[PDB]
Symmetry: none
Subunit: 487 residues, 2 copies
């Protein structure tokens, strides 16, 4: 009597839980409906799968409702309830309904459960780890050789079988609720989650010089490690295999820009884009490649120096000097020392923005101007000019040069000298030395007459030549010997 009251109380608890869970799943389905009315571009698929789930779950549950009614009717009669059945048919109805080899219903219920389980396998996308739990919740395996319907409805009372069928309905409801929750969570897969929030230090220059200023912008970023947006940068699209990492090799010096935009598929179906624009500077590094014989400055003449600092422009490098004068002139400096035989330091100072960096000092040497060499600038009849540093020359070329010039050996364009005095020594027909002086830098008249009267092959000597340099001091340059020829 009351032993069945306990079982029917268990059945009442199961039915109340089924009512609760079945009304609960409707709320999630209603949330899916409201979300369908908003952005039905991909919510359509989840809504349709949820509708199919509802169809199949309600089909199986109505099947089990009719099975409970058929088990209850196989006890008392057609007019019998499904809750408080009288007495206990511990052999009569539960086995005859679910095991009759003619109208076998156990196999049919088992195959319907199998259909629902495989449908769940097809509907639940993510949480495949939980798909195994949902499958175990609908296990199709009895005990030993007895089939699934066998052990459950072999020698079972009628209420003891109605309770099992109600528990099967409850399991179907819980499974469909979990699958509906899975679909709702799958509607929001790549919807811009916040995962890593880090603090970063963006430095202007990772390497600074003593006296300069370190500049670092310290910012936070709340980026998503899941979504992969399209990052168009400097015209072309960045390869998605870079995970958003613009790489550009620093070419020629300058200020290369980095401008573009990020386009990301938003969670509401529309694409959102944000434009960005920044700059990255490039410099070229130090080559202190100085042969140990460069450090010489000549006193008097303007020495052109090239002072350069990496990154700092040409109008910010400002250098001084202690021994002489250092003056800018376009892009080059010009040095004029004073004390010959002593060193000279050049203090370099740059200015990076609003602060004066004092660069490393450099000590050079100072040496007077070298002595030039005298020559007879002669050109043959074919036009091209040559210099004559002693030897054999024609009377015509000797007279055409007008005088004795003076220039450096490795001439180039540096310095230009001039002569102030020189003598010409001849030897007459008695061994006497006739030293005739010249009109400064040009030949005299006695000299030109001697040269006109010199026989083919005789020697005359340009001696005691005093020349002048731009440093304002006169110097004695070596003598030369000339032999008259005929050409």
């Amino acid at each position: 009597s009351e032993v069945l009251d306990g079982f029917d109380k268990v059945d009442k608890s199961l039915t109340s839980s089924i009512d609760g869970s079945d009304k609960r799943n409707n709320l999630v389905l209603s949330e899916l409906n409201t979300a369908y009315r908003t952005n039905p571009e991909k919510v359509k698929v989840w809504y349709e799968r949820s509708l199919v789930l509802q169809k199949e779950a309600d089909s199986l549950c109505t099947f089990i409702d009719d099975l409970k009614l058929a088990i209850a009717r196989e006890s008392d009669g057609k007019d019998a309830k499904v809750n408080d059945i009288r007495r206990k048919d511990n052999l009569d109805a539960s086995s005859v309904v679910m095991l009759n080899p003619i109208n076998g219903k156990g196999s049919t219920l088992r195959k319907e459960v199998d259909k629902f389980r495989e449908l769940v396998a097809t509907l639940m996308t993510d949480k495949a780890k939980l798909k195994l739990i949902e499958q175990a919740l609908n296990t199709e395996s009895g005990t030993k050789g007895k089939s699934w319907e066998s052990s459950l409805f072999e020698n079972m009372p009628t209420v003891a079988a109605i309770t099992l069928l109600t528990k099967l309905q409850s399991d179907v409801r819980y499974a469909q609720g979990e699958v509906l929750a899975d679909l709702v969570k799958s509607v929001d897969v790549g919807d811009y989650r916040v995962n890593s929030i880090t603090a970063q230090v963006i430095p202007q220059s990772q390497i600074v010089m003593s006296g300069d200023t370190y500049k670092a912008n310290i910012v936070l970023s709340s980026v998503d490690t899941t979504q992969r947006p399209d990052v168009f940068v400097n015209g072309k699209l960045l390869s998605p295999e870079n995970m958003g990492l613009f790489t550009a090799t620093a070419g020629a010096p300058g200020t290369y820009p980095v401008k573009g935009y990020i386009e990301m598929m938003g969670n509401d179906g529309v694409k959102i884009r944000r434009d960005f624009e920044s700059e990255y500077f490039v410099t070229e590094p130090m080559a202190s490649v100085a042969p140990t014989m460069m450090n010489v400055l000549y006193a008097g003449i303007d020495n052109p120096i090239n002072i350069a600092v990496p990154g700092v422009a040409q109008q910010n490098v400002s250098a001084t000097i202690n021994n002489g004068t250092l003056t800018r002139r376009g892009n080059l400096w010009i040095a004029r020392p004073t004390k010959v035989g002593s060193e000279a330091i050049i203090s370099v100072t740059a200015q990076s923005g609003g602060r004066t960096i004092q660069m490393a000092k450099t000590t050079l040497r100072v040496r007077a101007l070298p002595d030039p060499l005298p020559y007879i600038e002669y050109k043959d009849v074919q036009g091209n000019t040559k210099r004559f540093k002693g030897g054999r020359l024609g009377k015509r070329e000797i007279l055409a040069a007008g005088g004795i010039k003076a220039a450096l050996d490795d001439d180039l364009l540096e310095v230009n000298y001039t002569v102030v005095k020189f003598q010409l020594v001849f030897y007459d027909s008695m061994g006497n030395s006739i030293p005739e002086v010249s009109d400064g830098a040009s030949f005299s008249e006695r000299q030109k007459r001697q040269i006109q009267n010199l026989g083919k092959g005789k020697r005359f000597y340009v001696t005691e030549v005093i020349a002048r340099g731009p440093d304002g001091i006169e110097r004695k340059i070596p003598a030369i010997e000339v032999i008259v020829n005929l050409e």
Copy 2:
């Protein structure tokens, strides 16, 4: 109770136990998901993860209580056997100690906790509140209605059903606590594209690295950027600026902190470093861009912050090797140019630097001189003019050297001539015995009256570069 009804009760018991053990794993899995999300971004998950912990605490201390109740009912039934008896009546309704009232008090406590934790979908909470109802029929208590006249296995299966309900309720509350974490929205905060570079100022030949991302920056606040012991003033917009002092490696250590939207201060630590090298001065005259051929030109290559053990340079014109802390260049193509391409090696990279262009010439021809020690004790270099007829022969002969003092190299005379002039106008040339005066030269110097001249002419002197040159001549006026 017949054995078949007992079998049915125990079958329902085992099926409900299977449901419990499944919905238990499906809850520990959600707790693990929450724990991983808390490992990732903890600031927005602390509250809900701690609430899930509170739930697992207070939901397991109730299932353990119901397990104890089942064990006590079984103990009473076994003590009676040592059917349909008072197994659930002496345990749940004993006026001395009846655990039914305590059970429903614990159920009300857990239900109030579930009501406290469930935030969104309060109808779902109202549903959970119905699965844990404490109400009875007619004038009986809840436990009095659930355990009055019911056998052992019926009461045990009902308690197992209560455990199953508690487990499913816990799972639903966990799902709610997941939704609340996921809807901690940061997308209502405006998103901007950020270019985060490794270094904004790079060198040529290197590379510029910069991640390009979308960050949810919140310009509505004034964040605290604590940097190196002292906080940055709020009007700096988080911009660390320090003048570089002594050269070396200086750190940039600290944190940033800003008040989140949900009231939890998000703080993130950072530690970077900036290197201070030495000031560079590239001073170089353009007139001195010369590498004399033949000989060994000493060059010194210096690079900031890189010792000479890593620098490597080459040259198209000839050879360039090392001789300690400096290189030595040896060009072999006169007149043309010579470019030196330098290569440095810092941390895991080979930097190609500036190609320095230089001009190559030949060693300048020296000047000849007669090195004479005057009778006063000094040493001078006669180069034309008057000289005595003893300081000449005492010198030995003609020497030659650079008038300047770039005297890392020195020259040697190999041949010269003395050109006397006879008493008839013709010239008398006498060759030399190397760099010293020949015997005939000494004799004809000894036979020279005052005021007479002789000329050192055709002075071939050998150089350290190999080639020999013809250097100028010098006039000597013999006097007494």
